[PDB]
Structure formats: structure tokens, C-alpha cells
Design a protein around this ligand. Structure first.
Ligand SMILES: N[C@@](CCCC[B-](O)(O)O)(C(=O)O)C1CCN(Cc2ccc(Cl)c(Cl)c2)CC1
Ligand SMILES: N[C@@](CCCC[B-](O)(O)O)(C(=O)O)C1CCN(Cc2ccc(Cl)c(Cl)c2)CC1
Ligand SMILES: N[C@@](CCCC[B-](O)(O)O)(C(=O)O)C1CCN(Cc2ccc(Cl)c(Cl)c2)CC1
Ligand SMILES: [Cl-]
Ligand SMILES: [Cl-]
Ligand SMILES: [Cl-]
Ligand SMILES: [Cs+]
Ligand SMILES: [Cs+]
Ligand SMILES: [Cs+]
Ligand SMILES: [Cs+]
Ligand SMILES: [Cs+]
Ligand SMILES: [Cs+]
Ligand SMILES: [Cs+]
Ligand SMILES: [Cs+]
Ligand SMILES: [Cs+]
Ligand SMILES: [Mn+2]
Ligand SMILES: [Mn+2]
Ligand SMILES: [Mn+2]
Ligand SMILES: [Mn+2]
Ligand SMILES: [Mn+2]
Ligand SMILES: [Mn+2]
Lengths: 336, 336, 336
């Protein structure tokens, strides 16, 4: 009765991809929730594989290079993440989805790198208000969480500056393997690159005009037309409207409703090809206590959908019956 | 110009169906609002018929039986409610809708029981995040507000334990007479029963895929295909998204928008068959002061829609004209 | 690459159209935001033309007349506004949109009056929870922000009382030139007038049944069928749901989502006929600090859409390239 009967859970508390402290508490926000319990109530066996420890260098060891902040912390963390994800995905080779909770979105360079080592023909569905595809000299901020796809996309490599410590970060994605949903705050140079190299993208304007059901269908058709490929689902929590996920660093008004979010994850889950889902940019240090609780529960419902939770209900494993307990029913009594 | 020119209002402050104190203040939350005034501004004559007094036994008088909490308080309250609703509906036999404000949802066993005495061929539209159809041995909580339909549905009576004090609670509904809208947190055994006995149900997944306009149409077609039957509309306020109804005991993210809620009620009202509407699970003791105000106003707009309020406007009874007052208009002056 | 390369910005801090203090701070709420900066980042040259000073008489100078509150302050302010807007629109005669930030909605009588002097064949798109078309003897409140269209519509002039100081407020609109979107709280006499004189109107019920995409299309077809006419877009911030614009004086539940709001403005902008947009009823003195921030940002995104901001992204003016900076790319290095 289950598409996935087992899953792995992994925390990655990245916080050097952007300057607001708190994304390192993202994984704990989910472990504190009722997520594990709810997943078990649906019959799925979920193993907590712990946390990856990011490499966090001090300032002297990691000065700006090409405007990037903490780029050596990033290159070392990226390789450490990729190694771990690769090994998790190879022991898994019904499939066993890996659920990753961040951490700021700079982690995706590592998770996709490692994922692609185990499954080189994968596709990527990127759910985000933002493109996360700035090349370093175009980044207005220097924040690495705004650049993680640019290092992975083969077509962009003539706009990435060479750095020795980045050598092991091999571009493993073709522009044709990525589709965006949720965009509403692209930088001009992101827009240029996306359109030039033909990356499939469905912005909130597309969601408004097409509806989320057509958008999901067209995104899957664009990068996984016959469901042949493993799916890496990279879900930025700020893809969702600030009304349901306020506790995140770069919140943008006019986002996906929670329900639109669930629909993306439900459809992706139902392909049977969900290989990795990562959830980025939870920051429980942002907003009120009630803000944190809203963001937490949105995250939990999103992750549950990813593992196959069905809003139209699940059947019980064992169907209970009164007579087995030696109890007299109303129907039985009315008979006698 | 009005489908219903008169209506009755009844409070039922049930609070022994679930453990959070405060649902007993639900009716007063609405009497304190501008509801009565707004209904009068549309030309509808609304009579406040007061409150039913629930039977609330002490612990010694009402211990657990088959895991149910406060089950004798429930059986006695159910009969008291049914008697009152029956008598209100028979004096009413244009029709006169009865508007009931709860109170936790355990009251529905009584309201439907009494309603069905006056109108035995009725149908039920159940608007809820939850199924409220757990049979007692499957209930994980023992809370009666999670069980009220199970006692009414004929097909379920071989899974209801016999209790003498429940004898007068006669199953008056066929599975074929009920349709759900809004579901998103069914228990596994609810799912089993609903599907086994073919109860029409439209979950939030159906609402996402079909749209609320098709959902309403299909729900009405399923249980009232030619508008021959009286309608009992049982509206749990937690059917609506927590963003618009936060002050309720079992809030579930991803609910109906207020507008989707209004559309259900507008269509149900416009059939001319709305016989009873009850609004359950208001708890003004939950949430901030602003939470309570949001929940209150959502409830008021919902109830107004039920009585035929039209968002596209109403015509005046008397059309006013300047000349009657002996006043010179701009047009008149420009003439002379 | 731009439909409008220049725009003017004008504040009108009206506050005598309604009794809650604070709408006079509306323009400053927007000047304090990042609006100007964001508009510049899209390549649009925006000139701040300052504020109009409303005429605010004391009580003795301005007693009630025909139940209207502050009607002489209104007539004098209306003429002062109209003169200023006219002169701004004539120097502008690619077109140069005028962006007006209120101020309560009583200002529209003046802005449309002056606009129509420069462009007499204009059409009006009125985005509002309310009709703002009460004639003075039908107004239950006496608040002028609830009456501004009634003075402009030729067909209504036999229901406007003559007042000498109103003589210069010439009715410049035909009922056939106006379309509403967003209505959900019409007064009965508004409903009567709208239907009698055939004013196009699309309420939230129409938005629910038709969807905003069809609604926009039909509104534009009704009053600007071949895009021949200049458009006056009069956007009441309370058209939007209180969840995204809480800081306004007459908030009504069940409004446009922010996204629906953006879609209206995006389509209106894209006609190339957007001549004036005014944004009314911001009140930063209402609600919490976070309420004010939500309302502010909703306003900013709305105004940006009006000037042609594209949620699917903009192309850069200058495309940057690594080699120009004498930097070695990853691709280049891999070659050698
Ligand atoms: N793209 C961003 C955000 C990336 C967020 C990372 B995510 O939360 O993981 O999706 C990034 O940091 O790369 C910024 C960049 C700056 N824009 C506004 C902007 C645009 C153009 C100019 Cl010239 C300037 Cl000065 C500012 C907002 C998004
Ligand atoms: N169905 C509920 C809620 C009924 C709310 C009553 B209403 O607010 O009037 O609609 C009820 O109380 O009957 C609960 C039951 C427990 N589930 C979660 C759950 C599911 C399965 C298991 Cl095994 C466990 Cl331990 C927990 C949530 C809804
Ligand atoms: N139309 C209103 C609001 C206008 C708001 C101006 B806006 O914020 O610029 O759109 C205005 O002030 O003109 C009121 C009038 C009173 N109704 C409720 C009502 C209806 C009928 C009667 Cl008989 C009574 Cl006593 C009350 C709400 C909107
Ligand atoms: Cl597209
Ligand atoms: Cl169905
Ligand atoms: Cl219409
Ligand atoms: Cs826990
Ligand atoms: Cs696109
Ligand atoms: Cs905080
Ligand atoms: Cs009252
Ligand atoms: Cs179903
Ligand atoms: Cs409280
Ligand atoms: Cs500023
Ligand atoms: Cs209409
Ligand atoms: Cs305040
Ligand atoms: Mn983002
Ligand atoms: Mn991101
Ligand atoms: Mn419920
Ligand atoms: Mn319920
Ligand atoms: Mn308004
Ligand atoms: Mn208005």
C-alpha cells in the first residue's frame, strides 16, 4: 500500500551561506516537531541518520574571493556533504528516499553533487522564490545561498571563476535537467542565464495564469517526461507565502499557498522517482514564537507529502472489529 | 426578494465533547458580534431562541465506558438537544432555517437526530477538516466530538457498542445521505468506513484538483440530486484555514479559504433547501485577542452567507429620491 | 524593453474623507519603503513631485450639509487636487504614468476630475471592497470617502444635491466608462444605482466563480474594448484581503489575494494605457507594527506591478562577462 516503505533523514545545519544566524537550528526545529511520529502513523520506517557538520572557518582562513563570502567554508562543506549523501544513496541502491533538512540553501551544491555521483542521470526540481543561480561576479550580496546551482550547471562554467579548492566541485547538471517552480524575485543576470540556456521555469505569474496543476505537469514533462529519471527535489521554504512560512531569511510576498506546496510534493512523491528531498532556509531565530510554529508545521506537512502522505486518508493495517473483543454491538443487540 | 424571510437562532454550548475549555462561549461570541444587526440590514427576521443547557455530570456519575469520555453526559445532552430541535423544526413546518451556534461538534448527534424526526428524508453536508465518524473502540482520544456521526449512520451499527442509555439515539442516516467537504485529517479507521460504505467525500486534495465550484456541485449531486431533500449543513469552523479561524481546538493547516467557505454556504442557501445550519468548534478562549476577532468575523460572514447574504449586493426596500425631501438636485439646478 | 520608461509620483494625504486619523501618513509610508529603489533597479526613471496640501477647514467653517462631513474641505480639496493633476498630465502629453499615493479615497473625485481635463475619454477601473458611489442623502455615515464617484457620474446628477461650492466639480464620467473589481460590501443604494445605470462590476463572488483572469479580461472589455482609452486605475488597498493589507480603515474579510491584486495591475500596465494609478486608504496608524509592514509591502508590490515590474524577471542592461575583467574561468582553465 506504500510507494516508499523506508526513508532516511539527515540534517545539514549550514549557516555560512547567508548572514542571518539561525538556519543551523533548522534540523532541530523538525526533530522537535511531531514529524517522525506522524510519518510512523502512516507506516513508513524513518531512520534518523544524524547531522552533517559544516566546515566553518574563521575570517583569516576564509577572506572574500571574487566577492564571495565564506567561499572556502563552502567548498570544504560542499565536498563533505557530497561524500555523505553519495554514501547514503549508494547503500540505498521500492526505493529509499533521503529527506534532508537544512540549513541555508548553499548546501544544495553538495547534496546534488553527491546525489549525482550515485545517480548521474537525475533531474532537479527547484522550488523557490529565488533562482539561486547567480554566478559569483554577478552576485550583489556575496552570499553563497544565492549561488548554489551556478557551480553545478555545465552551460555556466565560462562565467564561474576558477578556484583550486573548487576543483572537486564538478558540474554535474545540464541546463535541460532543471525546472523551477515558485520564482518571484529573480535577479536580472539570473533571468538572462535561465532564458539563454533554456532552463524550464514556472514563476508565480505562470502559477497564477496556468494554475499549479498544469505547472507541476509541465515542470515534470520538461525535465522528466517519461518518469525515467531520479528526482532531486530542492524545496526552499520561502517558496511558500510568508503568511505560512514567515521564519526564513529572504521572505517574499505573493508565494505559493501551503496547498500549492503540498500539490507539488504530492505529485513528485507519486511519480515513484523521489530520490532526495531537501528543505532549505528554515530559521527559527526569525520572527515571533507563533511565526516559528507556523513555519515548523508548514515544513512538517510539506515533508509528509513528500513521503506519500495522502490528504484523502490512509487505510488501517489491521481493521478492528467488536466481536473479537467479546463486545455486544448495537446491531447485535437489536437482533436479540 | 428573499428566499428565507425568517430564521431562528439557537445556541448550544457543548464542551464535554472535547477537553479544551471554551467552546461553551461559542454562542456568546456570535451574540456579541454584529451578526444579528447585519442579518436585519438584509431584511431577514431573526428570532433568538436562547440556549440549550447541556447535561454535564460529575466524574463519579460518568466514568469512561468503551474508552469514551463523558458518554452519559453525551447521551443525555443528545436527547435534550434532539427534543428541542425537533420542536423548533415542527412549529416551522418560504421555510424557516434554524441557525445553531456551538459548542463543540458532539452536539451534531442531537441536532441531526431531532432534525430527522421532523424531516426524516434529509441529507447532511459535513464541512470539516475531520470525519467525526470514529466508532468508540477506534477512537484514539475518547473525545465525543470525534464520534458524532458514527451513532447516526445505519451501516455502522455493528461497530457501535450497545449501551442502554444510548437506546433512544436511533440511527437516522444512511451512508448515502452524507457528503463531506474539507477533509484533511482523517483517521485510518474513518477512511476505511467512509470508503467501505460509499460515503461521498471531497477532501482538500479534491478541492485543489477540482476547484470548490465543482466540489459543491458534486457534493449536492451525490446526496441531493434534484434538490428534493431538506439539508442539514454541519459546518465545523476548523474546516477553514487556521489563518482565518485560528480560535478552535483542532486546527489543521491547509484549509478552505474564507471565500471557499462562503461559496459552499452561498450555494447551499440558494437551493432553497437549507433547513438547519450549525456552526461548531468556536473557542474564544483559544488564541490571542486578534485571533478571536478573526474567528468571530469568519463565523459571522459564513452564517450570513447561509441565510442568503449576497456579496454582489442587495436592493433597497425603499428607493430614496431627492424631490420627495424638497431638495434641489444638481441636474434640476442646471436646468433652471 | 520598457513600456513606461518614466513616471511621476505624487502624494495626496487626504484625511477628511473619513474619521480615523492616519491616512495622511500614507504617502510617507511609501517614501520610507524601498519602492523608489526597486523601481530604479528595473530601469524606470521615477520623479517625486511632492505632496498636494489638502484644504482642512475648522468645524465652524465646515458644518454638516446634507449629512456630509467636511464637505467644503472636500470641495476645495477636490479643486486643488484636480488643478495639480491636470497640470501634471498635460506636461506629460512612450507615455508617462502618474502614481498617486493617498490619503483616503475621497481624493479620487479630484484626481479623476483633473485627469479627465487632460484626457476626457478616459475609462476608470475601480478596485475596492466598496462602491464609493453613495449619493449624499443615502450615505449612512456622512464620510466623503464613501461618495467620490457619485459626483463624477453624469447619470447620477439628479440624486446629488446642488451646492454652490460644488459647481466646479463637473461630472466627467459616464456610467459606461467605469468597471469595478473586488466588491464585497456594497450598500443597498449603491447596488441599486450600479445595476440601474449598467455599471460594469465584478464582485468577489464573480472573482470566485470566473477566476481573476476572466474578470480582468471582462472588465477591460466592458470599458476599454480595443485599448483606445487612457486608464485611470483607482486602487483601494482594502480591495486586498485583510491578511495582506490589515492597516486600513474599513477592512473586509474575503478579499483579493496579493497575487490577484498583482494580476489586475500587471494586465492594466501591459495595455500600455495606464495613465494614472492611485492607491488609497493606507493607514499606518492602524494595527500592529507588523500589520503596517505587511500593508506597506503589499502596496509596494502592487505599485511596482503597475509600473511594469515582471515577476518572471527582467533582463540586465549590460551583460557582464568574466574575460573583460581579466579573470580565468573554470571552463577556460579546464581547456588549458
Ligand atoms: N538573489 C539574492 C537572494 C538569494 C536568496 C537565497 B535563497 O533564500 O536560498 O533562495 C542573492 O543574494 O543573490 C538577492 C540578490 C539581490 N536582490 C535584489 C537586488 C537585485 C539587483 C540589484 Cl543590482 C540589487 Cl543591488 C539588489 C534580491 C535577491
Ligand atoms: N479524529 C480526531 C479529531 C476529531 C476532532 C473533532 B472536530 O474538531 O469536531 O472535527 C479524534 O479525536 O477522534 C483525532 C484523532 C487522532 N488523530 C491523530 C492520530 C491518528 C491515529 C493515531 Cl493511531 C493516533 Cl495515536 C493519532 C487526529 C484527529
Ligand atoms: N459604504 C460605506 C463604506 C465606504 C468606505 C470608503 B472606502 O474605504 O474609500 O472604499 C460608507 O461609509 O459609505 C459603509 C456604509 C455602511 N455600510 C454598512 C451599512 C449598510 C446599510 C445601513 Cl442602513 C447601515 Cl446603518 C450600515 C458599510 C459601508
Ligand atoms: Cl514557462
Ligand atoms: Cl470524490
Ligand atoms: Cl458581472
Ligand atoms: Cs519530538
Ligand atoms: Cs516562464
Ligand atoms: Cs525573534
Ligand atoms: Cs451585539
Ligand atoms: Cs474522494
Ligand atoms: Cs489565550
Ligand atoms: Cs527610502
Ligand atoms: Cs456582477
Ligand atoms: Cs496602533
Ligand atoms: Mn529563496
Ligand atoms: Mn533558495
Ligand atoms: Mn474538525
Ligand atoms: Mn467537527
Ligand atoms: Mn474601500
Ligand atoms: Mn475606496
Amino acid at each position: 500500500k506504500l510507494l516508499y516503505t523506508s526513508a532516511n533523514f539527515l540534517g545539514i545545519p549550514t549557516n555560512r551561506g547567508q548572514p542571518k544566524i539561525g538556519t543551523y537550528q533548522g534540523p532541530e526545529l523538525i526533530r522537535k516537531s511531531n514529524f517522525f511520529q506522524l510519518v510512523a502513523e502512516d507506516g513508513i520506517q524513518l531512520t534518523d541518520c544524524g547531522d552533517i557538520i559544516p566546515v566553518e572557518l574563521n575570517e583569516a582562513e576564509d577572506p572574500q574571493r571574487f566577492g564571495m563570502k565564506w567561499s572556502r567554508s563552502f567548498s570544504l562543506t560542499t565536498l563533505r556533504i557530497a561524500e555523505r549523501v553519495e554514501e547514503l544513496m549508494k547503500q540505498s541502491n521500492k526505493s529509499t528516499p533521503l529527506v534532508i533538512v537544512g540549513g541555508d540553501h548553499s548546501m544544495a551544491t553538495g547534496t546534488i553533487l553527491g546525489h549525482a555521483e550515485a545517480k548521474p542521470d537525475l533531474c532537479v526540481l527547484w522550488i523557490d522564490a529565488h533562482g539561486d543561480i547567480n554566478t559569483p561576479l554577478n552576485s550583489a550580496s556575496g552570499n553563497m545561498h544565492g549561488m548554489p546551482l551556478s557551480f553545478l550547471v555545465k552551460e555556466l562554467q565560462d562565467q564561474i571563476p576558477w578556484l583550486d579548492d573548487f576543483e572537486g566541485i564538478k558540474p554535474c547538471l545540464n541546463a535541460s535537467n532543471i525546472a523551477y517552480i515558485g520564482l518571484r524575485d529573480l535577479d536580472a543576470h539570473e533571468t538572462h542565464d535561465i532564458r539563454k540556456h533554456g532552463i524550464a521555469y514556472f514563476t508565480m505569474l505562470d502559477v497564477d495564469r496556468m494554475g499549479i496543476e498544469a505547472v507541476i505537469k509541465e515542470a515534470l514533462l520538461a525535465v522528466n517526461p517519461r518518469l525515467e529519471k531520479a528526482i532531486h527535489l530542492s524545496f526552499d521554504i520561502d517558496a511558500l507565502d510568508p503568511l505560512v512560512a514567515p521564519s526564513t531569511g529572504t521572505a517574499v510576498p505573493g508565494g505559493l499557498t501551503l496547498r500549492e506546496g503540498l500539490r507539488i510534493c504530492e505529485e513528485v512523491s507519486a511519480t515513484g522517482k523521489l530520490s532526495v528531498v531537501e528543505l532549505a532556509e528554515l530559521n527559527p531565530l526569525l520572527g515571533s514564537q507563533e511565526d516559528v510554529l507556523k513555519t515548523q508545521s508548514s515544513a512538517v506537512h510539506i515533508l509528509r507529502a513528500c513521503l506519500g502522505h495522502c490528504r484523502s486518508g490512509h487505510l488501517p493495517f489491521k481493521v478492528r472489529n467488536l466481536t473479537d473483543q467479546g463486545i455486544m454491538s448495537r446491531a447485535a443487540h437489536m437482533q436479540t
